[PDB]
Design a protein around this ligand. Structure first.
Ligand SMILES: *[C@@H]1O[C@H](CO)[C@@H](O[C@@H]2O[C@H](CO)[C@@H](O[C@@H]3O[C@H](CO)[C@@H](O)[C@H](O[C@H]4O[C@H](CO)[C@@H](O)[C@H](O)[C@@H]4O)[C@@H]3O)[C@H](O)[C@H]2NC(C)=O)[C@H](O)[C@H]1NC(C)=O
Ligand SMILES: *[C@@H]1O[C@H](CO)[C@@H](O[C@@H]2O[C@H](CO)[C@@H](O[C@@H]3O[C@H](CO)[C@@H](O)[C@H](O)[C@@H]3O)[C@H](O)[C@H]2NC(C)=O)[C@H](O)[C@H]1NC(C)=O
Ligand SMILES: *[C@@H]1O[C@H](CO)[C@@H](O[C@@H]2O[C@H](CO)[C@@H](O)[C@H](O)[C@H]2NC(C)=O)[C@H](O)[C@H]1NC(C)=O
Ligand SMILES: *[C@@H]1O[C@H](CO)[C@@H](O)[C@H](O)[C@H]1NC(C)=O
Ligand SMILES: *[C@@H]1O[C@H](CO)[C@@H](O)[C@H](O)[C@H]1NC(C)=O
Ligand SMILES: *[C@@H]1O[C@H](CO)[C@@H](O)[C@H](O)[C@H]1NC(C)=O
Ligand SMILES: *[C@@H]1O[C@H](CO)[C@@H](O)[C@H](O)[C@H]1NC(C)=O
Lengths: 191, 292
């Protein structure tokens, strides 16, 4: 019996600090029984468990892991003979601590109306979103405008509708499954 | 021929003030015979040389008025032969000093669902005699008044056993032997036991390619500290939103700025109190104009 190809449409997502959700698209059977072999492998530590789980299921939980730890998974479709391995899917587990403050803060493109701001984040804290709290510098302090960005891929955002010749105090937070960064660094921006 | 009457005991002073005095005259028991049609109450300042002042006493408890402050008076009763006499024993009393003003810098802040904290300036005593602070709190929603006496020296009270989201009008004064003037009415709301109501009268207007004003209304007394206007593009991406947290609840309008032209937006609005945020029944929709 020739070996089957690896599972089609694989994806790995953090369920929790101690678990990962391995999702994949099911396939039509050819038994003449069959199961799916899944191995996960820690990057930071030297730990490799091998799960042999039923073939007809859609997805599997990878329980008993450590927090804030990177893992690499790959799986086969085993029948009478052993199949071929999939590509290496990588995903961190959810963080057990607060994330760091974003470095390399570059404010630019200053005009009367609009402005742009740039930042960079450290990988491996499960950063779900970042917030750019900006407000007027003076002692009035009657309001602020947070702008929460739910896509971590983004590293720039253009602010719009600022009043000309006005001093704005811009802070930048970063968020995750636990909490948020606590930076003491304020950043001025005059229009 | 007969035996004329006079009381056994001196008058008793029930209550006094700088201006007035209230006195049980004690016409009974008394020596002598018969009935009494009318009776006097003689009074004057102890050592001073003028005429004794007489008032006719019908009931028993009498109210002396037009007195002088800080002066020692003496009191005695006469009874007349009826139908139409020696004066009875003497009681001395001193009228009260002048009534102090109320405490300054009165500030009533709420601190819980069931408590309010009143604070005033430390007041230095002008007079020598003793003094204390009387504090009245009065519910507006329900009929509920409570009086709290507070020592003269310390400078604040915790008004407690109050109800959640109920306003109380408060006054205070400084009492001595005499009773001082009432302060101005401080008013405040106790904290909310529930989430705040959703803001009413949400009206979007002045829509533009890069602007749109939103206006709302909020019910008073739910301890609403702030409101938040959340907006995002209606597309299924949900890549980002923008919160506009307004620090004071007095503001009822906000102009959104820097919006994308020809773009559908989803506006939500939240009131915020001591507990949390108001739950919307429904979100709001707007579409920005295109340029020309
Ligand atoms: C009713 O309201 C009044 C007014 O709010 C309230 O008075 C408060 O009482 C507290 C406690 O007696 C006092 O607080 C002081 O505040 C100073 C700074 O102004 C602090 O430094 C003092 O010490 C604190 O902070 C230190 C920090 O280094 C700590 O090391 C220390 O352990 C203390 O925590 C001090 O406490 C002050 O008189 C006011 N405070 C305020 C903020 O108004 C009154 O107590 C309320 N309640 C009642 C029942 O009257
Ligand atoms: C982690 O893995 C679990 C199971 O190990 C995943 O369970 C799947 O969850 C989805 C909902 O996201 C469900 O799918 C359902 O499929 C039927 C048709 O088969 C459809 O009618 C439903 O509307 C729904 O889409 C279902 O509970 C389950 N999938 C299947 C095929 O049984 C779970 O999604 C994974 N969790 C995460 C966070 O990725
Ligand atoms: C004014 O004072 C008189 C004398 O103290 C009061 O009469 C006494 O009242 C109490 C009971 O309330 C008892 O000591 C005696 O029963 C009373 N004694 C006499 C002699 O009557 C009286 O209460 C006061 N009068 C009024 C009208 O209030
Ligand atoms: C997958 O496997 C079992 C094998 O006994 C099968 O009976 C069952 O229908 C499947 N499980 C489901 C649909 O949850
Ligand atoms: C400034 O912003 C505009 C878009 O409004 C963009 O095309 C341009 O590249 C920006 N310039 C810099 C230096 O980032
Ligand atoms: C107020 O006077 C009382 C008298 O018993 C004393 O015990 C208390 O310490 C005084 N409070 C002050 C000075 O704050
Ligand atoms: C809407 O608000 C007032 C008129 O009611 C005006 O000052 C403002 O310019 C209007 N907004 C826009 C975007 O035109």
């Amino acid at each position: 019996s020739i070996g089957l190809p690896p599972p089609r449409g694989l994806n790995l997502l953090p369920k929790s600090q101690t678990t990962l959700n391995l999702t994949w698209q099911p396939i039509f059977p050819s038994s003449e029984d069959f199961y799916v072999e899944v191995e996960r492998r820690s990057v930071q530590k030297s730990d490799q468990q091998n799960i042999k789980v039923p073939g007809n299921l859609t997805s599997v939980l990878l329980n008993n892991l450590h927090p804030r730890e990177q893992y690499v998974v790959r799986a086969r479709v085993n029948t009478k003979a052993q199949g071929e391995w999939s590509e290496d899917l990588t995903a961190w587990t959810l963080s057990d601590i607060l994330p760091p403050q974003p470095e390399n803060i570059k404010i630019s493109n200053i005009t009367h109306s609009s402005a742009v701001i740039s930042w960079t984040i450290l990988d491996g804290y499960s950063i779900s979103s970042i917030t750019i709290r900006y407000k007027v510098q003076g002692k009035n302090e009657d309001q602020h405008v947070d702008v929460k960005i739910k896509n971590a891929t983004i590293t720039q955002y253009q602010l719009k509708g600022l009043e000309p010749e006005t001093a704005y105090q811009v802070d930048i937070f970063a968020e995750n499954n636990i909490g948020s960064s606590n930076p003491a660094f304020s950043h001025e921006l005059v229009t």
